[PDB]
């Protein structure tokens, strides 16, 4: 089902096996860095335990990282069974194309991992640098969706820890700030009803 789909849920507890296999996984995990944080975070062990391996046979993972998650995110990436083959840099600008501990941070990083042997992807159409305006805090650029679509047109994709503004055609979005469940793919709907007959994910 081409149109946007999503599932409001705690990604620690959802049985992601009901969702099938995807050509692309993208995640923007709420890494446990520093302290406080305006949102809920996942511990390092919770991140390691995420059932990412069931989501793909052959495809690409896009994993946003920052701070010490540059190292932890590599750990998870490898643990989940991927090899990191690229690293996207989002250069953060204002509306006039000016860039916004030891150094000021002009950018954020997206690790690119490969699993299996993906075939029929259009490797090399885009470059590994995004220049795009900052929006709300932690809002990632929409350019990444176009890069991923040109890389793998028409295929099914899943985003982890997406917010409502993240839902896109051809994507299933999971996150705990989404509004309810919106599923249209009949195969997914069937397996969702079989696994969660009372619609209670817990």
């Amino acid at each position: 089902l081409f149109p946007p789909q999503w599932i409001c849920c705690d990604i620690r507890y959802l049985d992601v096996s009901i969702l099938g296999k995807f050509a692309v996984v993208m995640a923007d995990p709420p890494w446990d860095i520093h302290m406080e944080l305006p949102y809920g975070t996942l511990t390092d062990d919770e991140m390691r335990r995420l059932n990412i391996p069931v989501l793909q046979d052959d495809g690409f993972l896009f994993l946003w990282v920052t701070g010490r998650a540059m190292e932890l995110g590599r750990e998870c990436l490898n643990l989940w069974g991927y090899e990191r083959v690229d690293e996207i840099i989002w250069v953060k600008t204002n509306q006039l194309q000016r860039i916004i501990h030891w150094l000021n941070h002009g950018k954020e990083h997206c690790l690119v991992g490969v699993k299996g042997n993906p075939q029929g992807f259009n490797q090399g159409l885009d470059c590994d640098v995004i220049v795009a305006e900052v929006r709300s805090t932690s809002h990632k650029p929409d350019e990444i969706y176009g890069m991923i679509e040109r890389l793998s047109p028409g295929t099914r994709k899943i985003e982890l820890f997406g917010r409502p503004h993240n839902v896109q055609p051809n994507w299933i979005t999971l996150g705990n700030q989404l509004d309810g469940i919106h599923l249209l793919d009949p195969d997914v709907v069937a397996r969702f009803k079989q696994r969660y007959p009372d619609g209670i994910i817990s």
Binding site: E87, I89, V91, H101, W102, H109, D128
Partner: peptide, 27 residues
């Protein structure tokens, strides 16, 4: 560089007793 060194260079840093504090990108 831009390939496997982004992983192996972090292994080097840890092998030599460092922790990464910045990732400087030459664009």
């Amino acid at each position: 560089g831009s390939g496997e060194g982004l992983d192996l260079g972090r292994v080097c840093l840890r092998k030599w007793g460092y922790r990464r504090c910045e990732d400087i990108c030459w664009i």
